[PDB]
């Protein structure tokens, strides 16, 4: 059938071995923001176990208002105090510009998106931009650690980015 069908079949085997329920608050009091990229298995990359960490993911690991919203809830309601941001090499966000993307969408749909596609040219500098977005935000101030990294999709290694 479809991939959804196969993934649902995989869930049968997952459920057989499942242990729960666990408490809602992340047991390691940490939120991870990462790209949606297919090559990043965030749990395996960082040795995360079930129940430990919030994981927030979008196209390009962009600190949008949804990321701020998700961090605010994570911190204020569920007690997380560490933030890890995970960009990576060979990101799709490096491959297009915002104007061209919007133009193509409009060409085909007749409508231009209200949202910014949020492309950027340099993953390392955009970690710095992303860290700055969090640092200056009035709603996400609870963190005791805020660190950013670029994941190398060729080596599997994290490289830290300094502001």
Q: Which residues, numbered 20-39, are part of the site for its own copies (CB under 8 A)?
A: 20-22, 24-31, 36-39
Q: Which stretch binds Zn ion (CB under 5 A): 28-36, 63-71, 94-102, 148-156?
A: 28-36
- CA-nearest of 49, 71, 46, 64 to 119 is 64
Site residues for Zn ion, window 73-92 (CB under 5 A)?
91
Site residues for its own copies, window 87-126 (CB under 8 A)?
90, 92-93, 95-96, 101, 104-105, 109, 111, 113-118
- The answer to whether residues 88 and 35 touch, using CB atoms and an 8 Å cutoff, is yes
**Residue 47 binds what, of its own copies, Zn ion, none (CB under 5 to 8 Å, by partner type)?**
its own copies
End-to-end alpha-carbon separation of the chain, Å? 48
Site residues for its own copies, window 68-87 (CB under 8 A)?
68-70, 72-74, 76-78, 82, 84
35 annotated as ligand-binding: yes
The torsion of the CA quartet 131, 134, 135, 138, rounded to 10 degrees, works out to 170
**Residue 28 binds what, of Zn ion, its own copies, none (CB under 5 to 8 Å, by partner type)?**
its own copies
Site residues for Zn ion, window 31-70 (CB under 5 A)?
35, 37
Q: Look at residue 52 and give its three-state secondary structure.
A: coil
* # of chain residues touching its own copies (CB under 8 A): 92
120: tokens are: 């950027």
- CA-nearest of 76, 19, 83 to 54 is 83
**If binding is defined by CB under 8 A, does position 14 make contact with its own copies?**
yes
- The answer to whether residues 122 and 91 touch, using CB atoms and an 8 Å cutoff, is no
* Feature table: binding site for Zn(2+): 35, 37, 88, 91
* Feature table: binding site: 35, 37, 88, 91
């Amino acid at each position: 059938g479809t991939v959804t069908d196969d993934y649902l079949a995989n869930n049968v085997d997952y459920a057989s071995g499942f242990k729960g329920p666990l408490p809602m608050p992340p047991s390691k009091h940490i939120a991870i923001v990462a790209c949606m990229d297919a090559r990043l298995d965030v749990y395996r990359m960082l040795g995360i176990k079930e129940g430990e960490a919030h994981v927030i993911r979008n196209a390009g690991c962009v600190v949008t208002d949804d990321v701020i919203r998700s961090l605010a809830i994570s911190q204020r309601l569920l007690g997380t105090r560490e933030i890890i941001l995970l960009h990576h090499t060979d990101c799709g966000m490096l491959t297009f510009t915002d104007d061209d993307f919007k133009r193509a969408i409009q060409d085909e749909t007749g409508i231009r998106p209200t949202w910014s596609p949020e492309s950027y040219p340099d993953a390392v500098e955009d970690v710095r931009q992303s860290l700055r977005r969090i640092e200056v935000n009035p709603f996400v101030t609870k963190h005791t650690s805020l660190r950013g990294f670029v994941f190398d999709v060729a080596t599997g290694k994290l490289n830290e980015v300094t502001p």
